């Protein structure tokens, strides 16, 4: 099935960022994945500080990938990007649009429940 990799790496220059990206895609191909496309979210200041493998980082580059891969590729890539230092975080998830949206007909009015108690004068 489809797998979206959300990638958050440290703020650094285009050459080494592209090096990290190409080696990650090489790891995908080695595991046997097929990349659909690459999406750049861009560089942004992180909301909260993070302690990486060896440092702390306040700014970070957000990238996103979508690809196809088997199951074991998931864990293999998780451990790969965990051993990787340039990446701050990497998370694999599934595609939302693959879950076809159930057709909605609006919100039904909930009538107040009744007959919880018997007819008694008390």
């Amino acid at each position: 099935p489809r797998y979206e990799l959300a990638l958050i790496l440290k703020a650094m220059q285009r050459p080494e960022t592209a090096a990290t990206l190409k080696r990650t895609i090489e790891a995908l191909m080695d595991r046997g994945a097929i990349v659909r496309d690459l999406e750049n979210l861009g560089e942004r200041a992180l909301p909260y500080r993070i302690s990486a493998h060896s440092q702390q980082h306040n700014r970070g580059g957000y990238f996103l990938v979508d690809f196809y891969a088997p199951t074991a590729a998931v864990e293999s890539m998780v451990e790969h990007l965990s051993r990787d230092i340039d990446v701050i975080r990497g998370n694999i998830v599934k595609h939302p649009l693959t879950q076809e949206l159930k057709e909605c007909e609006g919100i039904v009015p909930v009538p107040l429940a009744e007959k919880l108690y018997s007819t008694k004068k008390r």
Binding site: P47, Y48, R49, I50
Partner: protein
């Protein structure tokens, strides 16, 4: 901690109105349900009596909301009796 300071749970003073600042602060905290949580987490709350408190609070909310609905529904009826005899 590692989050930035002076964004959350803040309130800016205007014209040195410290009392109104703290009033707005505790109002928003209670509307978010924070002072309640703090005073309850002072001591540990067992799951059983937690569930009991929670169910009682649900029923209390239900009864109070329905009473308020009927009060707002019947406030207009409280007027000068037109037909005395």
């Amino acid at each position: 901690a590692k989050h930035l300071k002076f964004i959350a749970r803040t309130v800016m003073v205007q014209e040195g109105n410290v009392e109104s600042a703290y009033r707005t602060l505790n109002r928003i905290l209670t509307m978010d349900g924070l002072i309640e949580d703090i005073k309850h987490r002072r001591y540990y709350e067992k799951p059983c009596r937690r569930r009991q408190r929670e169910s009682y609070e649900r029923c209390r909310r239900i009864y109070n909301m329905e009473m308020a609905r009927k009060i707002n529904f019947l406030m207009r009826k409280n007027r000068a009796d037109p037909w005395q005899g």
